[PDB]
Amino acid sequence: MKKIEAIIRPFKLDEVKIALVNAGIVGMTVSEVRGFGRQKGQTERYRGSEYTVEFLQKLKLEIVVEDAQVDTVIDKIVAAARTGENGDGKIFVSPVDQTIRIRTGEKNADAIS
Amino acid sequence: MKKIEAIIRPFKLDEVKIALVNAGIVGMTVSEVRGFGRQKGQTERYRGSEYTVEFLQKLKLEIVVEDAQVDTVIDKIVAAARTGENGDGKIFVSPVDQTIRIRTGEKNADAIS
Amino acid sequence: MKKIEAIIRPFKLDEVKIALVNAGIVGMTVSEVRGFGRQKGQTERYRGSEYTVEFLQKLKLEIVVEDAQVDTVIDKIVAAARTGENGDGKIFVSPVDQTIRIRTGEKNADAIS
């Protein structure tokens, strides 16, 4: 099992969300964050101004899936979230040792099906 | 060391929190999130309406503990957070390689005691 | 690759942020959380009152770096965030299996450079 954490542009939420639902994702969590991602020598454009290290609003998507579904999920997010301008986002994949469904106590594969 | 991340119903915060404090948990983090968890063919009830993939408000609890305490923490959350209606929540356990207490620089077991 | 998650006092954001930018960090994410950290028998001071398990506002910083940069990042956060009063914060380091830059599809070391 893996956790996929994707930082995306806020306006992209709808476009990304539809891609994931159509791909068969059945659970996801979203939160509001702020961030910077300043590659060397670049500025990020937002509403007609250029930024270096100021924090900009982003959204964090969290999706826990079976290992065999990670690449599909990654591909769907990338294709829907990208624009070609710096600031499009970043995805981090991390291990999940156990998953538990609260209502039933189901575990692991059963809790993500 | 493990991180326990629990997504719960917002109203349950107090009921869950009291269970964990009584069990001896000494540190926890809470954040506001939104989410869906649509098992196939189901709808989630909220304030008299039925939802499919709309995002609903949830809370994310994060608790870092020693390995030997994980199952106790899981049990306390499940028992306090559940209601029997879909939407009760989900728990993800993940590895923590190092913990550092900022004030003192204490590490690992010392930083979670 | 590792994720560094640091819970800090909200007022410290600026002091911590400047330390990390000067150390060469190029990406970070911040979120608003609440928390308690009650070591046995202690109270946390906030705006002239003493707290046990009430939730206090904190900030969560998330920084994904190469393994060889973790200790530098940890040191910079600790030195900038600390005050000597309980409630200064806690840092959790966890594994990241894959990183993807959304705009380009670059992976891993390429996505964090």
Ligand SMILES: Nc1ncnc2c1ncn2[C@@H]1O[C@H](COP(=O)(O)OP(=O)(O)OP(=O)(O)O)[C@@H](O)[C@H]1O
């Ligand atoms: N290494 C990192 N650790 C934590 N958060 C990061 C990191 N890099 C980026 N982020 C988060 O992702 C957001 C988007 O980053 P961004 O798209 O600018 O990445 P980038 O590597 O600079 O790529 P690009 O060249 O496309 O801008 C940031 O604002 C921040 O919230």
Ligand SMILES: Nc1ncnc2c1ncn2[C@@H]1O[C@H](COP(=O)(O)OP(=O)(O)OP(=O)(O)O)[C@@H](O)[C@H]1O
């Ligand atoms: N696989 C997942 N990845 C990330 N977040 C998830 C996932 N599944 C659920 N969540 C989060 O947990 C919340 C509660 O999920 P929920 O209780 O609906 O899970 P479920 O598996 O559908 O179980 P139930 O049948 O009890 O509804 C969601 O709204 C979402 O925030």
Ligand SMILES: Nc1ncnc2c1ncn2[C@@H]1O[C@H](COP(=O)(O)OP(=O)(O)OP(=O)(O)O)[C@@H](O)[C@H]1O
């Ligand atoms: N084990 C933990 N799991 C999750 N979050 C924690 C944990 N311990 C602390 N936190 C988070 O970090 C914040 C700061 O904790 P705090 O500085 O009080 O830690 P502490 O171990 O009690 O150290 P101190 O003695 O310096 O107070 C908390 O309010 C909470 O948000």
Ligand SMILES: [Cl-]
């Ligand atoms: Cl493009």
Ligand SMILES: [Cl-]
């Ligand atoms: Cl029931």
Ligand SMILES: [Cl-]
């Ligand atoms: Cl001091």
Ligand SMILES: [Mg+2]
């Ligand atoms: Mg960038």
Ligand SMILES: [Mg+2]
């Ligand atoms: Mg559900």
Ligand SMILES: [Mg+2]
């Ligand atoms: Mg404390």
